Design a binder for these strands. Structure first.
Ligand SMILES: [Mg+2]
Ligand SMILES: [Mg+2]
Ligand SMILES: [Mg+2]
Ligand SMILES: [Mg+2]
Ligand SMILES: [Mg+2]
Ligand SMILES: [Mg+2]
Ligand SMILES: [Mg+2]
Ligand SMILES: [Mg+2]
Ligand SMILES: [Mg+2]
Ligand SMILES: [Mg+2]
Ligand SMILES: [Mg+2]
Ligand SMILES: [Mg+2]
Ligand SMILES: [Mg+2]
Ligand SMILES: [Mg+2]
Ligand SMILES: [Mg+2]
Ligand SMILES: [Mg+2]
Ligand SMILES: [Mg+2]
Ligand SMILES: [Mg+2]
Ligand SMILES: [Mg+2]
Ligand SMILES: [Mg+2]
Ligand SMILES: [Mg+2]
Ligand SMILES: [Mg+2]
Ligand SMILES: [Mg+2]
Ligand SMILES: [Zn+2]
Lengths: 116, 136, 177, 78, 60, 51
RNA sequence: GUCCGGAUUGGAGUCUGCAACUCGACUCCAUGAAGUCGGAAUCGCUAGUAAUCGUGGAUCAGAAUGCCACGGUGAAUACGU
RNA sequence: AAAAUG
RNA sequence: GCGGGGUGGAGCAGCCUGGUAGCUCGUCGGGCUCAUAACCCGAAGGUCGUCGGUUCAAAUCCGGCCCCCGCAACCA
RNA sequence: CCGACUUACCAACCCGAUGCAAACUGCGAAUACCGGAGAAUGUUAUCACGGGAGACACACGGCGGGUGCUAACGUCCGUC
RNA sequence: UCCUCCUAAAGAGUAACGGAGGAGCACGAAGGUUGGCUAAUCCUGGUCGGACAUCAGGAGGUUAGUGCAAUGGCAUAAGCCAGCUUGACUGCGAGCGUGACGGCGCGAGCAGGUGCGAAAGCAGGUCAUAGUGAUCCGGUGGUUCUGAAUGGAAGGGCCAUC
RNA sequence: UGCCUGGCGGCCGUAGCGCGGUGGUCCCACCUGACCCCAUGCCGAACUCAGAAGUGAAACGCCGUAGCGCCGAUGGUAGUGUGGGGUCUCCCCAUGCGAGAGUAGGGAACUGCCAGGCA
């Protein structure tokens, strides 16, 4: 499979972030959409979220699955997180390479003020 | 003479022989010779009993041997003191607990089976009894 | 991409009719062609393996991957990790071009060619065939040839069965006997 | 005659040092083991010889967690 | 494809005796003059006891 | 017992040295590593030398 | 290992002969082996000889690389005992 | 140089 | 009990240190001779005591059996 | 070249049935041990430090065992 | 002398000329980190090519692997590959384990300086448990700490090491 | 509020396999191109990027289905602490604890947060 290998690729970092009790900035990427979630240390409550499936972000974008859309989602999620006053998260790349759309999202979340 | 073709280890702790047997039903034939007592059956005894019963039936029907002598038994040579390491393996035994079906037979009348099992029992160091297959 | 355009324009329709597939994705596809040279003579001479790789590069148009012994084998005097062959994986445009060159040029140049065996399917619609002499490919110059070498060709397909694989290959007028 | 046997190594004093519920100071060794027969849970470290030790003061807690039904040791704050 | 390590792969023309011409990318470098092709090989096209001969040689 | 003892001498001129071992036959090349020199309190190059 | 060599084998024939399976000679097409000068040893030859090249005959329906016979070309060397 | 036997 | 061994038909190497079987005689074929021997030329013949194991791989390393040799098998 | 039949026979893997293990475990006690709490009881029965030692040949019996022949008033551990 | 298993009686420990095996090393990468990856064996198809090389697919699911015994571990791999590297760092060390003792072991965290990583982080050698030798006497380097009237020096100390 | 989907968890086989059916508006998947960012010890397969013609074929999700896996009593049996006894290598009695296996049976998971589509 592809998803199975990716979950396997993601597990080590996820267990480390769980052991550290870090607040997690989780990214998910598909061919058409990118998603970001800030998840509480217990791993089962989503604090904030932004994604290209929400119309408030999809409407301003040429295409939901490129690096510009990833940047928009990263900026949106960091803005929401700072509205709820979070500012300290750990980046979980979910087995995706730290590159391309994921890196654009992470950089845009940084530029918006999220500390990781 | 039955003997394991191979074993992980050459020599074995004496151990004990408590408990009741597993395999207390006639499971392959219609008649069985079941141990009532407790003890060790050597390979030579198992063979002697098998020969007795086999000749009694004139090699008719079928015979199962339900026990296998897998326990090596060592002995020290004569005029050897104690210690200086465990003795050499000299023969093999099967531990026997009360209830153990030792032999089974089919393809003969019960009357010939009892005679054959009686002839076999006489070669054995442990008290035995004649049993028959049950429904449950 | 002549044979790929032929696949899409004709072979898809032909197979849909012949097998009554309920979706166009169900039509068998040619996924990859792998060329393998088992070069055992390399145990003593490494120029043999290098020349095999050069032949494979000329034939397929791709720099080959040198393969190495997975485990040590006394019977062939090989230790684990020893380079004893070379392969190329052909996909996409290169794969269709090689398929065309093979079918239309190289197979016609096989000495005494009387037709490819139709039983050489691995059980899941993948076809493997042997070549005994690399000169059948025009890319190999005849008067530059050092040693006589062959290779293995496997055509891996997305066919669920050997019959679908054979039908897919026959649609390209593969020279089945 | 003699024997080819007659050798053994020193006993290594492995095993559980503090059992479930025991109150321990940070740094205290909870189990000495070969490999991870027990795994490190919350507030518990795993040494180079797979020794599990408290990283915080509190009570030892043995648990079975995860998809492989593996045994974990955590320290719960008092 | 990785750069600078593959053979030169450029189009050529394969001319057969039977007048068939195919434009194929190749590593051969020059143009080709085929003696046979798929369109003319006998197996591709389709162009591929004793009593009889006894009677023919011994006519009575 | 083929590995022989060697010292790694600080290039900082402090005379500080580490010790380690080396298989001299299979690896005749001089071992060189960047290591902490506690005397000048910096990471500097250390060079192999006879024990 | 060839435009050397021509064994072996496939196919098709001819002729003699009641009859060419065992078991003939010859022809045509195809095939194209060993063999690149031969270990120890060993033979013949002193001149029109040796060497080499063809030719004929007896036996004989057919069946010689054998035998008997014939010419052409045509050497080397013999200090000596 | 060696050089047996029938 | 402790050392050492078992390899063409014979007697000896090879083992240690795994890959890759040697020497002398004998045997066979050819030669010299009237013939035989001697002599000359050319070959063949162990698959490593027997079972297992380790190894990619065993004459080789390991363990057990069988056989063979050396010592030792004492004090009362 | 290929191969066609047949076995006094042998027989893997698989499946079903049956046992065996100190150095087997997809299970698993009683006890024992560690920790916590609470009464009663007990001449503090506990721990630390300091003065003085003796002892370091054990024996038998019970239970759990190695060894020996589940021989020994045998031998070697554990525990009472 | 040291390591592993059993004897050993479900905490630790536990004897015998009890039952079985190993060590007296290896490795500047086989260490650190980041990214990636996943075994054995069998079946089918495939030039030479065969029981066994390399190739493709399937079955299988760790029956593989682990530098070397055995046990306990290992997929988030501790197993396989690559890039960059020197944390195989120096000073310390809450606390704990194990020893009659000498001693031996585990360790978060603090200071300094460092490597890998975008980052959270990880790194004070190696999956762990063998691979070892007290003290004396002396050798080498560093350090005036000492320096037998005084300045030096010798010799001693201390630190590193043989 | 309900159905469907995606992400992250709880839990760790009553939850997993097999088998039969099913779904594409959205989501997901395959998919389409690849000079590029980036990549293949060869290969755009993978990783990556730029997209949206096609299909749910595969994958995946959902629903159904006991051929399995799995869970699992009650009763009995084994063992066993303490005390007692015998014919003492092994057992029995009082009392307390009480399996494993098997049997009946259960069983085609359940659940929290956030987001999207549809009603
Ligand atoms: Mg000629
Ligand atoms: Mg020749
Ligand atoms: Mg020539
Ligand atoms: Mg004369
Ligand atoms: Mg002539
Ligand atoms: Mg004539
Ligand atoms: Mg004493
Ligand atoms: Mg004493
Ligand atoms: Mg005592
Ligand atoms: Mg006594
Ligand atoms: Mg214990
Ligand atoms: Mg105990
Ligand atoms: Mg004691
Ligand atoms: Mg890694
Ligand atoms: Mg590593
Ligand atoms: Mg390692
Ligand atoms: Mg190790
Ligand atoms: Mg000094
Ligand atoms: Mg002075
Ligand atoms: Mg794609
Ligand atoms: Mg479907
Ligand atoms: Mg039960
Ligand atoms: Mg189901
Ligand atoms: Zn043509």
């Amino acid at each position: 499979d592809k998803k199975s290998a990716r979950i396997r690729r993601a597990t080590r970092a996820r267990r480390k972030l769980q052991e550290l009790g870090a607040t997690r900035l989780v990214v998910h990427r598909t061919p058409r959409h990118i998603y970001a979630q800030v998840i509480a240390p217990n791993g089962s409550e989503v604090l904030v979220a932004a994604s290209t499936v929400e119309k408030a972000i999809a409407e301003q974008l040429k295409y939901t699955g490129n690096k510009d859309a990833a940047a928009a989602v990263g900026k949106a999620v960091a803005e929401r997180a700072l509205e709820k006053g979070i500012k300290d998260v750990s980046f979980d790349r979910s087995g995706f390479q730290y590159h391309g759309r994921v890196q654009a999202l992470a950089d845009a979340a940084r530029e918006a003020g999220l500390q990781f | 003479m039955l003997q394991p073709k191979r074993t992980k280890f050459r020599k074995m702790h004496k151990g004990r022989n408590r408990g009741l047997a597993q395999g207390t039903d006639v499971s392959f034939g219609s008649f069985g010779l079941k141990a009532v007592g407790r003890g060790r059956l050597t390979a030579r005894q198992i063979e002697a009993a098998r020969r007795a019963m086999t000749r009694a039936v004139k090699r008719q029907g079928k015979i199962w041997i339900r026990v296998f002598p897998d326990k090596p038994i060592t002995e020290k040579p004569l005029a050897v003191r104690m210690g200086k390491g465990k003795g050499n393996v000299e023969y093999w035994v099967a531990l026997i607990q009360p209830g153990k079906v030792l032999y089974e037979m089919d393809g003969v009348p019960e009357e010939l089976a009892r005679e054959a099992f009686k002839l076999a029992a006489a070669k054995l160091p442990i008290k035995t009894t004649f049993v028959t297959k049950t429904v449950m | 991409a002549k044979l790929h355009d032929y696949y899409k324009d004709e072979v898809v329709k032909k197979l849909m009719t012949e097998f009554n597939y309920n979706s166009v994705m169900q039509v068998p596809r040619v996924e990859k062609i792998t060329l393998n040279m088992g070069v055992g003579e390399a145990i003593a001479d490494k120029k043999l393996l290098d020349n095999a790789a050069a032949d494979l590069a000329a034939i397929s148009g791709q720099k080959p991957l040198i393969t190495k012994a997975r485990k040590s084998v006394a019977g062939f005097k090989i230790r684990q990790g020893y380079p004893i062959g070379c392969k190329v994986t052909l996909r996409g445009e290169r794969m269709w071009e090689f398929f065309e060159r093979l079918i239309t040029i190289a197979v016609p140049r096989i000495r005494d060619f009387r037709g490819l065996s139709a039983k050489s399917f691995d059980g899941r619609g993948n076809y493997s065939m042997g070549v005994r002499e690399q000169i059948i490919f025009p890319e190999i110059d005849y008067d530059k040839v050092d040693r006589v070498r062959g290779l293995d060709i496997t055509i891996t397909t997305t066919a669920k069965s050997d019959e679908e694989g054979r039908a897919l290959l026959a649609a390209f007028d593969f020279p089945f006997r | 005659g003699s024997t080819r046997n007659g050798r053994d190594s020193e006993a290594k004093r492995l095993g559980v040092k503090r059992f479930g519920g025991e109150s321990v100071l940070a740094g205290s060794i909870i189990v000495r083991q070969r490999g991870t027969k027990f795994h490190a849970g919350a507030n518990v470290g795993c040494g180079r010889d797979h020794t599990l030790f408290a990283k915080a003061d509190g009570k030892v807690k043995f648990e079975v967690k995860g998809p492989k039904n593996r045994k974990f040791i955590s320290i719960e704050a008092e | 494809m990785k750069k600078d390590i593959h053979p030169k792969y450029e189009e050529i023309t394969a001319s057969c005796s039977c007048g068939n011409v195919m434009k194929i990318r190749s590593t051969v470098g020059h143009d080709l003059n085929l003696d046979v092709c798929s369109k003319c090989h006998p197996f591709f096209t389709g162009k591929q006891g004793r009593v009889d001969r006894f009677n023919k040689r011994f006519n009575i | 017992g083929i590995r022989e003892k060697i010292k790694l001498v600080s290039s900082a001129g402090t005379g500080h040295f580490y010790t380690t071992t080396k298989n001299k036959r299979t690896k005749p090349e001089k071992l060189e590593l960047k290591k902490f020199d506690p005397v000048v309190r910096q990471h500097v190059i250390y060079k192999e030398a006879k024990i």
